[PDB]
Amino acid sequence: SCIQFTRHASDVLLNLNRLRSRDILTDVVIVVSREQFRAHKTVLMACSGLFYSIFTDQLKCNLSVINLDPEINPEGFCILLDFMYTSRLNLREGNIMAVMATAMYLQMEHVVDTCRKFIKAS
Amino acid sequence: SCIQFTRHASDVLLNLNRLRSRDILTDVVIVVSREQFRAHKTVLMACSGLFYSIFTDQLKCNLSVINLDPEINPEGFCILLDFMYTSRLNLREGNIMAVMATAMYLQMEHVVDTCRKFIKAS
Amino acid sequence: WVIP
Amino acid sequence: WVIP
Numbered sequence: 090s091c092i093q094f095t096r097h098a099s100d101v102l103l104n105l106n107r108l109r110s111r112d113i114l115t116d117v118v119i120v121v122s123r124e125q126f127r128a129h130k131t132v133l134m135a136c137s138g139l140f141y142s143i144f145t146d147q148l149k150c151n152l153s154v155i156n157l158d159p160e161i162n163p164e165g166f167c168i169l170l171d172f173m174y175t176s177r178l179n180l181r182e183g184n185i186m187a188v189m190a191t192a193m194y195l196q197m198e199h200v201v202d203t204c205r206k207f208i209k210a211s
Numbered sequence: 212s213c214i215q216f217t218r219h220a221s222d223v224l225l226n227l228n229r230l231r232s233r234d235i236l237t238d239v240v241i242v243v244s245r246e247q248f249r250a251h252k253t254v255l256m257a258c259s260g261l262f263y264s265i266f267t268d269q270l271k272c273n274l275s276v277i278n279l280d281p282e283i284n285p286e287g288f289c290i291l292l293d294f295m296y297t298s299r300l301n302l303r304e305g306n307i308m309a310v311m312a313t314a315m316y317l318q319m320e321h322v323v324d325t326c327r328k329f330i331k332a333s
Numbered sequence: 334w335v336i337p
Numbered sequence: 338w339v340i341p
């Protein structure tokens with residue numbers, strides 16, 4: 090018999106993104122080629138099958154630095170990290186291939202699905 | 212020119228609640244009278260003006276244990292912690308006063324607003 | 334607020 | 338997915 094506040098989840102995600110922009114309580118650095126991205130482990134796990142697997146591992150859960158596969162494009166990662174914290178995906182003709190490949194690696198099934206649909210249309 | 216995934220914020224919150232239920236990456240214990248509640252600092256900050264103030268403080272940001280004011284009712288806190296992680300508020304005739312008082316202390320303005328409306332109706 |  |  091609960092009541093529900095419709096905007097609560099969106100408001101929570103907006104505040105987590107504000108903490109990310111101000112570098113507050115970020116507990117991990119994701120290294121992609123030369124580029125570094127600060128984030129919250131819990132948000133990464135909630136969005137990605139790959140980060141979920143990494144941070145539930147008894148040894149990796151304690152690492153402050155995670156290095157991604159050298160094939161991963163920093164721009165593709167940046168677009169996906171922004172989506173994790175906002176629900177908004179900056180999908181463009183010039184980045185769709187790098188975004189789909191990065192989403193497949195990160196195990197973000199809904200992003201992979203929209204990339205496949207957008208590629209099929211063109 | 213982004214696209215948006217409608218269910219993303221709700222899905223993120225659902226996964227953060229699953230991490231909470233399994234005690235994964237919880238980094239703080241909130242003590243309310245004899246009762247202890249494990250949580251994620253970032254989620255508490257995103258939902259509460261009081262926790263936002265506590266964990267942005269250069270000294271308190273590093274505490275693993277936070278003790279609430281002895282006037283705070285553990286059941287009222289438990290109902291509010293559940294709302295933080297689910298958007299669902301278990302508001303009942305027998306708990307509304309303890310829920311409103313706890314929400315005022317935690318600075319959760321939307322919960323305070325619905326409690327005032329529900330009290331006014333009765 | 335809604336009835337979920 | 339929608340146009341926000």
Ligand SMILES: O=C1Cc2cc(Nc3cc(Cl)ncc3Cl)ccc2N1
Pocket residue numbers: 134135136137138139141196197198199226227229230
């Ligand atoms: O496409 C995706 C997105 C995703 C997220 C998570 N993260 C969780 C899943 C569960 Cl059941 N509990 C907790 C968490 Cl944080 C796992 C796999 C995938 N695949």
Ligand SMILES: O=C1Cc2cc(Nc3cc(Cl)ncc3Cl)ccc2N1
Pocket residue numbers: 104105107108256257258259260261263318319320321
């Ligand atoms: O009723 C409320 C809920 C709430 C949440 C937060 N938390 C934040 C606010 C901002 Cl601007 N950036 C980041 C965070 Cl985590 C502060 C005050 C209140 N009052």
Ligand SMILES: [Cl-]
Pocket residue numbers: 136197198199200201
């Ligand atoms: Cl996804």
Ligand SMILES: [Cl-]
Pocket residue numbers: 258319320321322323
């Ligand atoms: Cl609220």
